[PDB]
Amino acid sequence: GSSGSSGEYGYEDLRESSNSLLNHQLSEIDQARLYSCLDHMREVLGDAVPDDILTEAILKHKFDVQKALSVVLEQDGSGPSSG
């Protein structure tokens, strides 16, 4: 957390995501949130929609189902319009 990776230069050195797996694993905290969120949006879109889609949406608003949904909804609703 504290004193880790910051600044432009730093990133450069790092060169691409140092570790993917780790990142993926995500911090237990976030994870609990992601899952606690995904699950939700899951029972909604998850029905047919996969996880990634939802997962992204979440990361699309740094964990914000309320938004991820409002967006995940307008995303599909976009198709059917006008008449």
Side-chain angles (χ1 to χ4, degrees):
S2 296
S3 189
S5 202
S6 49
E8 197 212 74
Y9 244 93
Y11 253 66
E12 218 276 34
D13 314 88
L14 226 73
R15 198 169 140 275
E16 238 290 292
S17 202
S18 251
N19 282 339
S20 224
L21 186 106
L22 168 63
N23 275 97
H24 188 161
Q25 218 259 97
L26 249 173
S27 267
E28 51 212 70
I29 296 112
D30 293 338
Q31 226 201 255
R33 311 269 149 193
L34 181 291
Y35 266 123
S36 171
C37 293
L38 226 176
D39 264 9
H40 194 60
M41 227 145 61
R42 237 242 135 172
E43 233 61 273
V44 176
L45 307 109
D47 233 310
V49 172
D51 300 49
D52 288 338
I53 287 202
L54 307 170
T55 321
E56 256 246 39
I58 297 138
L59 315 146
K60 206 91 288 197
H61 325 296
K62 247 294 309 215
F63 299 74
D64 211 294
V65 169
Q66 250 254 336
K67 237 288 191 277
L69 256 172
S70 230
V71 188
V72 160
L73 295 159
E74 85 183 47
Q75 209 81 339
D76 268 15
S78 246
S81 202
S82 254

